[PDB]
Amino acid sequence: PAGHGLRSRTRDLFARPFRKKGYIPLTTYLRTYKVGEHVDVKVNGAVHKGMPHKFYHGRTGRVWNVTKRAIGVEINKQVGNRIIKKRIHVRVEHVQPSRCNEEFLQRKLNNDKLKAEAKVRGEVISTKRQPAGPKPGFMVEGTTIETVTPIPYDVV
């Protein structure tokens, strides 16, 4: 309304990708959701029911209520000077589970394992990542060194 209906400006947002038109692979239906997982809303052109508004294509949020044929997602929309946790129900064809927390949930166990292994021995460790910092010195075994000089200008 007010100049723009539900599916405006989506000449390309809602299209299928090239040579991925037609059928829905069964995996998008047999991936199962539980309340709390982080899922990515990406609308699917061909399934017209339960569709989310074009704003929500390409966001992530936590499932908050799961029903038959429908997932309840709870994502942040920024309006004014505040963040509203909007709650939408999207049909399962429009959501894919996210791999944002893949590394997190792997690393959680990878950490608790080393805190256990440290409790084994001298019970001091530090299970933190550090961003790539200064690289230490080393010798370079002198090889053939290629001299490069700026090229004279051939107009052609």
Partner 1 sequence: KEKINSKRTKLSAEEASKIKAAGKAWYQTMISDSDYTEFDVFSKWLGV
Partner 2 sequence: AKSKNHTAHNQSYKAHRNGIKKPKRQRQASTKGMDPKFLRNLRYSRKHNV
Partner 3 sequence: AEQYAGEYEAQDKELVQLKREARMKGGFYVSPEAKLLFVVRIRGINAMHPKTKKILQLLRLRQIFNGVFLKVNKATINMLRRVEPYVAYGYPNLKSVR
H or E element at residue 103: helix 102-120
What x-and-dash track marks residues 88-107 binding RNA by CB under 7 A? Answer: ----------x-xx--x--x
Of 79 and 148, which has the nearer Cβ to partner 1? Answer: 148
12 appears as a binding residue in the annotation:
yes
Residue 72 carries which side chain, given as an amino acid letter? G
Residue 71 CA from chain centroid, whole number = 18
Residues 60-89 that bind partner 2 (CB under 8 A): 64-67, 72, 76, 78, 80-83, 85, 87
| Half-sphere exposure of residue 91: CA atoms within 13 angstroms, side-chain side | 13
- Which of 86, 94, 11 has its CA nearest to residue 52? 94
134 binds partner 3 (CB under 8 A): yes
Residues lying near partner 3 in the complex (CB under 8 A): 130-143
Residues lying near partner 1 in the complex (CB under 8 A): 145, 147-149, 151-152, 154
